[PDB]
Amino acid sequence: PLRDLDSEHVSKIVRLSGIIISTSVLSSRATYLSIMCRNCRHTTSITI
Amino acid sequence: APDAVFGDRVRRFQEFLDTFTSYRDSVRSIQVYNSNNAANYNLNILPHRIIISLDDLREFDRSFWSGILVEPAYFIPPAEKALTDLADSMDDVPHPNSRHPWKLSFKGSFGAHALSPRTLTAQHLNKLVSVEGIVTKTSLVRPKLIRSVHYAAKTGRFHYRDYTDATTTLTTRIPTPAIYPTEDTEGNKLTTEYGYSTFIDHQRITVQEMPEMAPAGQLPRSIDVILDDDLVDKTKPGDRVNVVGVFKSLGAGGMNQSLIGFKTLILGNTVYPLHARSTGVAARQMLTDFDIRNINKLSKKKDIFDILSQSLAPSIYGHDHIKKAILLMLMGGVEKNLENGSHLRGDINILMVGDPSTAKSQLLRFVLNTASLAIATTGRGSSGVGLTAAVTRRLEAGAMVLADRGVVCIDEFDKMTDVDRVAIHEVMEQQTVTIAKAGIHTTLNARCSVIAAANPVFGQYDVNRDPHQNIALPDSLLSRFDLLFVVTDDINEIRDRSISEHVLRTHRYLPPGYLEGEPVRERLNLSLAVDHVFEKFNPLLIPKLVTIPFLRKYVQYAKERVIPQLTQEAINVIVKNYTDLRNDDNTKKSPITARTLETLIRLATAHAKVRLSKTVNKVDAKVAANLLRFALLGEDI
Amino acid sequence: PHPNSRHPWKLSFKGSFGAHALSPRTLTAQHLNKLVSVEGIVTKTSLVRPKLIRSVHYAAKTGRFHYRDYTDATTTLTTRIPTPAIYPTEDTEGNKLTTEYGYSTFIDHQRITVQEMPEMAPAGQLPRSIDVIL
Numbered sequence: 001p002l003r004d005l006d007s008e009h010v011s012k013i014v015r016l017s018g019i020i021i022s023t024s025v026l027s028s029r030a031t032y033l034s035i036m037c038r039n040c041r042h043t044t045s046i047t048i
Numbered sequence: 049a050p051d052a053v054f055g056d057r058v059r060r061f062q063e064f065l066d067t068f069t070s071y072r073d074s075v076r077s078i079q080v081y082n083s084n085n086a087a088n089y090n091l092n093i094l095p096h097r098i099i100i101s102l103d104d105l106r107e108f109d110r111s112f113w114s115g116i117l118v119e120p121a122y123f124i125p126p127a128e129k130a131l132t133d134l135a136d137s138m139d140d141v142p143h144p145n146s147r148h149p150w151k152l153s154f155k156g157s158f159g160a161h162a163l164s165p166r167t168l169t170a171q172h173l174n175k176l177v178s179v180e181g182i183v184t185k186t187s188l189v190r191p192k193l194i195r196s197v198h199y200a201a202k203t204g205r206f207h208y209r210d211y212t213d214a215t216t217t218l219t220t221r222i223p224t225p226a227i228y229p230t231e232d233t234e235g236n237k238l239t240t241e242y243g244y245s246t247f248i249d250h251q252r253i254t255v256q257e258m259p260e261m262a263p264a265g266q267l268p269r270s271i272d273v274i275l276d277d278d279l280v281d282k283t284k285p286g287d288r289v290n291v292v293g294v295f296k297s298l299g300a301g302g303m304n305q306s307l308i309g310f311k312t313l314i315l316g317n318t319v320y321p322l323h324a325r326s327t328g329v330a331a332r333q334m335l336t337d338f339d340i341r342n343i344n345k346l347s348k349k350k351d352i353f354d355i356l357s358q359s360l361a362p363s364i365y366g367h368d369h370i371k372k373a374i375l376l377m378l379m380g381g382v383e384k385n386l387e388n389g390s391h392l393r394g395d396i397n398i399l400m401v402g403d404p405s406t407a408k409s410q411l412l413r414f415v416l417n418t419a420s421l422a423i424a425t426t427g428r429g430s431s432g433v434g435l436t437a438a439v440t441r442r443l444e445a446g447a448m449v450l451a452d453r454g455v456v457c458i459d460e461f462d463k464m465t466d467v468d469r470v471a472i473h474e475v476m477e478q479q480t481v482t483i484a485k486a487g488i489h490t491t492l493n494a495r496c497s498v499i500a501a502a503n504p505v506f507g508q509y510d511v512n513r514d515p516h517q518n519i520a521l522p523d524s525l526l527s528r529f530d531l532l533f534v535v536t537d538d539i540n541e542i543r544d545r546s547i548s549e550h551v552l553r554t555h556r557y558l559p560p561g562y563l564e565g566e567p568v569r570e571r572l573n574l575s576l577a578v579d580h581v582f583e584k585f586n587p588l589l590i591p592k593l594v595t596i597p598f599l600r601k602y603v604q605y606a607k608e609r610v611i612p613q614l615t616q617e618a619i620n621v622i623v624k625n626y627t628d629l630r631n632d633d634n635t636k637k638s639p640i641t642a643r644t645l646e647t648l649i650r651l652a653t654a655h656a657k658v659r660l661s662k663t664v665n666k667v668d669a670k671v672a673a674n675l676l677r678f679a680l681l682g683e684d685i
Numbered sequence: 686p687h688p689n690s691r692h693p694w695k696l697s698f699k700g701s702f703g704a705h706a707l708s709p710r711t712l713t714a715q716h717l718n719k720l721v722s723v724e725g726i727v728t729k730t731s732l733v734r735p736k737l738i739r740s741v742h743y744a745a746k747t748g749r750f751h752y753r754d755y756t757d758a759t760t761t762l763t764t765r766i767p768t769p770a771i772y773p774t775e776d777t778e779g780n781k782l783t784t785e786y787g788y789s790t791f792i793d794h795q796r797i798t799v800q801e802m803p804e805m806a807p808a809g810q811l812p813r814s815i816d817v818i819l
C-alpha cells in the first residue's frame with residue numbers, strides 16, 4: 001500500500017496500487033547526442 | 049567551407065526544379081509582380097516563398113523526398129539554395145533599387161509525419177512534420193534584430209553587425225554571442241542607425257489538439273510553432289491550423305551545467321488555415337474558368353433563382369420560400385457606408401417560428417454546413433458573453449464577433465435570456481458590439497446575418513390565436529428579423545403521403561462507392577481555406593438541382609464580384625409595396641416599420657445579386673416584395 | 686586556364702623605402718607593424734619544413750573525402766580569432782578517418798636569421814639579429 005512504503009523500500013522494486021490523477025506532457029530526453037567543442041571541432045557522442 | 053554533399057543536393061534539387069516547370073513559372077510570376085508594383089510606386093510585395101508538392105518530389109527523386117521528410121536539416125537548406133540560385137538566374141530584370149534568399153514551403157501527403165500535438169512524440173524530433181490543431185495563443189509579432197547598422201561620426205563611417213540565433217537555421221552552428229557594438233574597434237562612439245538596421249518579424253503561436261478530435265475529458269496537448277517574416281499574422285486564436293515545419297530540439301535540457309528536458313518546438317515552414325464548421329475561418333474556393341463559365345451560363349437562365357432555391361435542401365420537402373429567403377441571406381444585400389459615418393445594414397436576418405419537427409433545425413444545420421462562414425449557437429447554451437465579446441485586460445471574441453461577415457445560426461431562439469436579448473438587439477441593426485467594460489471601450493464589428501429557429505409559447509402554433517401571443521418575443525426584437533416565417537404542421541393527406549415518400553426516398557440512398565449494407569464513413573471535413581454542375585441524386589421526382597459545392601461556388605462568385613445598384617424602376621415597386629404594407633390592414637404576422645422598407649431594398653439587392661446583375665431591375669423588387677408578402681401574410685400571388 | 690578568388694597572388698615590393706630602409710641594429714619596436722626593408726647577412730637558415738595548411742581524410746565506411754583547413758598567426762598580416770581546430774581523427778558520426786597524404790596541402794616554411802653585415806656593423810660590438818619567415 002502507498003501508505004506502507006518505509007525507507008527500507010528505497011532503491012528496490014515495489015508493487016503498489018493506486019489511481020492516476022495526473023499525466024504530464026511528454027518531455028524529450030537525450031538517449032544519444034552528438035557534441036562538438038566550441039573552441040575546436042572535436043566531435044564526440046554521449047550515449048544514454 | 050563548401051561541402052560536396054551540399055553541392056550534390058543543391059544540383060539535384062536544381063534538376064528537380066528544372067523538371068517541374070511550374071516552379072520557374074511561380075518564381076517568375078512572383079518576381080514580375082514585385083518588379084511591376086516596385087516600378088509602379090517607384091499594393092503589397094509577394095514573399096520569396098514557393099509551395100513545393102512533396103508528391104512531385106517523390107515522383108522525381110524518392111530519396112530526396114525521404115531526405116527532406118526524415119532529415120530536413122540536411123536537405124532543406126540545399127533545396128532553398130537551389131531555389132535562390134534559380135531565382136537569381138531568372139532575375140535578368142532586377143527589381144528597381146546568393147541574394148534575396150528564397151524560402152521553401154511544403155504540401156502534399158506526409159504519411160506518418162502528418163500528426164497532431166498529442167501524437168507528436170520525441171521520436172519525430174528533427175523531422176519535417178505536418179501538425180493539425182487549433183490555435184490557442186498568438187504572441188505579439190515582435191521584430192528581431194538580424195543586422196544592426198551604426199554610424200561613427202569621428203570617422204564618418206557606417207559599420208554593421210549580423211546576429212544569429214538557434215532558431216534561424218535548421219542546422220546547429222557554433223554559438224557566437226557577438227555583443228551589440230557600442231563603440232568602434234578603435235574607441236569611437238557609435239550611434240545606432242534605426243531604419244538601416246534589419247528587423248525580422250517573429251511570432252510564437254501555440255497549436256493545441258482540435259476539440260473535434262481531442263479525447264473527451266482529457267487535458268489537451270499543445271506544441272509551440274515559430275513563424276518568421278512572412279508566416280506571422282497568418283492565423284488568429286481559435287483558428288484551425290495545419291502547420292508544416294521541422295520539429296526541432298533546442299538548448300541543452302539541463303545537461304549544460306550553469307531544465308527537466310530539452311526545449312522542443314516547431315520551426316514553421318508553412319501555415320494553412322483550415323475551414324471547419326462553426327469556426328472563424330471562411331471558406332475560400334478555387335473558381336476555375338470552367339466554373340465561372342457555368343455560373344454565368346446558369347445565371348442567364350430565367351428560373352435560376354428557383355434552381356438555386358430547390359437545390360439548397362432537396363432532402364427537406366417543401367419550405368420553398370424559406371429556402372428562397374435562405375439563399376437571399378446567403379447572397380445578402382450591399383451595406384452602405386455614408387460619408388458622414390452612418391451605416392446601412394446589408395445583411396438579411398431570418399426567423400423561423402414553428403411546430404415541432406418542421407425541419408427548422410435541419411434548415412439551420414444545412415446553412416451551417418453550406419455557408420462560407422457560419423457559427424452555430426443555441427439559446428442559453430451561449431450567453432451574451434458567449435455571443436458578443438468578453439473581457440479576459442484583453443478581449444475574447446464571442447459567437448457574433450467571430451461570425452463577422454458571416455452567418456449566425458441560433459437554434460432555440462425563444463429560450464434566450466433578456467440579458468442576451470439586448471446584446472442581440474445591438475448586433476442585428478447597428479452591426480457592432482460596444483463593450484465599455486473594465487476600462488476597455490471598444491466597438492467590435494459584428495456584421496453578421498442571423499438565422500434563428502424558435503418554438504411557440506404552448507409548443508403548438510394555435511391557428512385560432514394571433515401571432516403576437518404565439519411568439520412571446522419582444523416586438524422590437526421581431527422588427528430586426530427581416531423575414532419571420534411561421535411554419536405549422538398541418539395534417540393534410542396529400543402532403544402527408546408526399547413528405548413520407550420523400551423521407552423514405554432520402555433514407556433509401558447509397559453513396560457511389562458503397563455497398564448495400566456498408567456503414568457510411570464520416571470525416572470531419574477539414575477543408576483548406578485557400579466536377580459536374582448538377583446533382584445526380586434527386587430526392588424530388590421537376591427542375592434541375594445543382595450540387596452543393598457548385599452552389600457554394602455560385603454564391604461566392606455572386607457575393608464577391610457583384611455589387612448591384614438600385615434603380616428608379618425598382619424604387620417605384622419598392623415604395624409602392626412598402627406604402628401598401630404600411631397602410632393596408634391585413635393583421636400581419638410581424639409589424640411594419642421603416643426597417644420593412646430596408647428589408648424590401650435588401651431582398652431586391654440580394655435577388656439582383658442572384659442573377660449576377662449589377663442593377664436592381666423591376667423584377668427583383670417585385671420578387672423581393674412577393675417573398676416579403678408571403679412572409680408577412682402567406683399570399684401566393 | 687592552366688591545364689587541370691582562385692590561385693591567390695602574392696605581392697613583393699621594391700623601390701625607395703626612405704626611413705623604413707633599416708638594419709637589424711636600427712630596427713626598433715617603433716617599426717613594428719610596418720613594411721620595412723632590412724639589409725644584413727644571413728647567419729642561420731632553418732630546415733625548409735612543410736606546414737600543413739589543409740588535411741584531406743578518407744572515411745571508408747561512407748567512402749567519402751573530408752578536409753580541414755589550418756591557420757596560424759604568421760599566415761595573415763591581420764590578427765584572426767585563434768581557432769585551434771584539432772586534427773580530425775574520426776568523422777562527425779564516429780567513422781574512423783584515414784589521412785590521405787598527397788591530397789593534403791603542405792606549404793614550404795623557412796625561418797632565417799638576418800644579422801647586421803660585418804662591413805657596416807660597429808667594430809667590437811655584439812651584432813644584432815632579426816628573424817625572417819619565408
Ligand SMILES: Nc1ncnc2c1ncn2[C@@H]1O[C@H](COP(=O)(O)OP(=O)(O)O)[C@@H](O)[C@H]1O
Pocket residue numbers: 363364365366403404405406407408409410411547550551
Ligand atoms: N418538411 C419536412 N421535410 C423533410 N424532412 C422533414 C420535414 N419536417 C421534418 N423532417 C424531418 O424531421 C426530423 C427532425 O426535424 P428537426 O429539424 O429536428 O425539427 P425541429 O425543427 O422541430 O427541431 C429530421 O430528420 C427532418 O429531416
Ligand SMILES: [Mg+2]
Pocket residue numbers: 408409459460501
Ligand atoms: Mg429544433
Ligand SMILES: [Zn+2]
Pocket residue numbers: 037038039040041042
Ligand atoms: Zn576543444
